[PDB]
CSV table of C-alpha atoms and ligand atoms in Angstrom, one decimal:
chain,number,residue,atom,x,y,z
M,1,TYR,CA,139.5,-106.5,64.9
M,2,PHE,CA,140.2,-102.8,65.6
M,3,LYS,CA,140.7,-102.4,69.3
M,4,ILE,CA,140.3,-98.8,70.5
M,5,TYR,CA,141.3,-98.1,74.1
M,6,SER,CA,140.7,-94.7,75.6
M,7,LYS,CA,141.3,-92.7,78.8
M,8,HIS,CA,140.2,-89.2,79.7
M,9,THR,CA,142.3,-87.2,82.1
M,10,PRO,CA,141.8,-83.8,83.8
M,11,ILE,CA,145.2,-82.0,83.6
M,12,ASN,CA,146.6,-78.5,84.0
M,13,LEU,CA,150.0,-78.8,82.4
M,14,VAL,CA,150.8,-76.3,79.7
M,15,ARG,CA,153.0,-77.7,77.0
M,16,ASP,CA,154.1,-81.3,77.2
M,17,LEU,CA,153.0,-84.8,78.3
M,18,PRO,CA,152.5,-85.0,82.0
M,19,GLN,CA,154.6,-87.5,83.9
M,20,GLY,CA,152.6,-90.2,85.6
M,21,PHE,CA,150.7,-93.4,85.1
M,22,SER,CA,147.2,-94.1,83.8
M,23,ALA,CA,146.0,-97.4,82.6
M,24,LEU,CA,143.8,-97.1,79.4
M,25,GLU,CA,140.4,-98.8,79.6
M,26,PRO,CA,139.1,-100.5,76.4
M,27,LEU,CA,136.6,-98.3,74.6
M,28,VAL,CA,135.4,-100.3,71.6
M,29,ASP,CA,136.1,-103.4,69.5
M,30,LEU,CA,135.2,-103.1,65.9
M,31,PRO,CA,134.9,-106.0,63.4
M,32,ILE,CA,136.1,-104.0,60.4
M,33,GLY,CA,138.4,-106.7,58.8
M,34,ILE,CA,140.4,-104.3,56.6
M,35,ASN,CA,144.1,-103.6,55.9
M,36,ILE,CA,145.4,-100.5,57.7
M,37,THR,CA,148.9,-99.2,57.1
M,38,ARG,CA,148.3,-95.4,57.1
M,39,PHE,CA,146.2,-93.0,59.2
M,40,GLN,CA,145.1,-89.4,59.4
M,41,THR,CA,144.1,-87.1,62.2
M,42,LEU,CA,141.0,-85.0,61.5
M,43,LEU,CA,141.0,-81.4,62.8
M,44,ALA,CA,138.5,-78.5,62.8
M,45,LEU,CA,139.1,-75.0,61.5
M,46,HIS,CA,137.9,-71.9,63.3
M,47,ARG,CA,136.5,-69.1,61.0
M,48,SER,CA,135.6,-65.5,61.8
K,1,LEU,CA,132.2,-122.0,80.7
K,2,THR,CA,131.5,-125.1,82.9
K,3,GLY,CA,132.3,-125.6,86.5
K,4,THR,CA,131.2,-126.4,90.0
K,5,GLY,CA,130.9,-124.0,92.9
K,6,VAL,CA,128.7,-121.8,95.1
K,7,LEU,CA,127.6,-118.6,93.5
K,8,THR,CA,127.6,-115.7,96.1
K,9,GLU,CA,127.3,-111.9,96.2
K,10,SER,CA,130.6,-110.0,95.8
K,11,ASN,CA,132.1,-106.7,96.6
K,12,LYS,CA,134.6,-106.6,93.7
K,13,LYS,CA,134.2,-103.4,91.7
K,14,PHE,CA,134.3,-104.8,88.2
K,15,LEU,CA,134.9,-102.3,85.4
K,16,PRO,CA,132.2,-102.2,82.6
K,17,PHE,CA,134.3,-104.1,80.1
K,18,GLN,CA,135.3,-106.7,82.7
K,19,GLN,CA,133.3,-109.9,82.6
K,20,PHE,CA,135.0,-112.8,84.6
K,21,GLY,CA,137.9,-113.2,87.0
K,22,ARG,CA,140.8,-115.5,87.2
K,23,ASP,CA,143.1,-116.8,90.0
K,24,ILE,CA,146.8,-117.6,89.9
K,25,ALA,CA,145.9,-121.2,88.7
K,26,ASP,CA,143.8,-119.5,86.0
K,27,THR,CA,140.6,-121.2,87.2
K,28,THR,CA,137.6,-118.8,87.1
K,29,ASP,CA,136.9,-117.2,90.4
K,30,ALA,CA,134.1,-114.7,89.5
K,31,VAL,CA,131.7,-114.3,86.5
K,32,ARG,CA,129.2,-111.8,85.3
K,33,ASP,CA,125.9,-113.4,84.6
K,34,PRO,CA,124.2,-112.7,81.3
K,35,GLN,CA,120.7,-111.2,81.0
K,36,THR,CA,121.0,-109.5,84.4
K,37,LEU,CA,124.6,-108.3,84.2
K,38,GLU,CA,125.2,-108.8,87.9
K,39,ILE,CA,128.6,-110.0,89.2
K,40,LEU,CA,128.6,-113.4,90.9
K,41,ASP,CA,131.6,-114.7,92.9
K,42,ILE,CA,132.4,-118.3,92.4
K,43,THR,CA,133.6,-120.1,95.6
K,44,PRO,CA,134.6,-123.7,95.4
K,45,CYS,CA,132.4,-126.1,97.3
K,46,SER,CA,133.7,-127.2,100.8
K,47,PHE,CA,136.2,-130.0,100.8
K,48,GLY,CA,139.0,-131.4,102.9
K,49,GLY,CA,140.8,-134.4,104.2
K,50,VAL,CA,139.2,-137.2,106.2
Y,101,NAG,C1,148.3,-104.4,53.5
Y,101,NAG,O1,148.9,-103.3,52.8
Y,101,NAG,C2,150.3,-103.3,52.7
Y,101,NAG,C3,150.7,-102.0,52.0
Y,101,NAG,O2,149.7,-101.7,50.9
Y,101,NAG,C4,150.8,-104.5,52.0
Y,101,NAG,O3,152.2,-104.5,52.0
Y,101,NAG,C5,150.3,-105.8,52.7
Y,101,NAG,O4,150.7,-106.9,52.0
Y,101,NAG,C6,148.8,-105.7,52.8
Y,101,NAG,N1,148.3,-106.9,53.5
Y,101,NAG,C7,147.2,-107.6,53.1
Y,101,NAG,C8,146.9,-108.8,53.9
Y,101,NAG,O5,146.6,-107.4,52.1
Y,102,NAG,C1,118.9,-109.8,78.0
Y,102,NAG,O1,120.3,-109.6,78.0
Y,102,NAG,C2,120.8,-108.3,77.8
Y,102,NAG,C3,122.2,-108.3,77.9
Y,102,NAG,O2,122.8,-108.8,76.7
Y,102,NAG,C4,120.1,-107.4,78.8
Y,102,NAG,O3,120.5,-106.0,78.6
Y,102,NAG,C5,118.6,-107.5,78.9
Y,102,NAG,O4,118.0,-106.7,79.9
Y,102,NAG,C6,118.2,-109.0,79.0
Y,102,NAG,N1,116.8,-109.1,78.9
Y,102,NAG,C7,116.0,-109.9,79.7
Y,102,NAG,C8,114.6,-109.9,79.5
Y,102,NAG,O5,116.6,-110.7,80.5
């Protein structure tokens, strides 16, 4: 089971992690049943 | 989940994921009913010493 917990926060701090507390609600539980040891973030380019 | 009690209306703001509730003893104190998704409080039936 892949448990994904999520929390969305309106902030106005410029550079770093804001200092505070916010408990993450559970978003989804996925019955994937696979071995995971490595992960990748996916980004988007901007072209002009 | 089996048990005995009176099912009453409640004012506990359950979050969407949250289904049931537990007391210190871990006995269930509130439950979310299937089919209708409402939140029913479970209050033990009246008892006491004679
Ligand atoms: C999962 O992958 C890692 C690295 O490839 C390996 O060491 C581990 O034994 C694997 N686990 C299972 C259950 O296959
Ligand atoms: C059946 O239960 C689901 C919850 O799993 C609910 O969304 C749906 O409205 C229920 N339908 C009826 C006819 O009770």
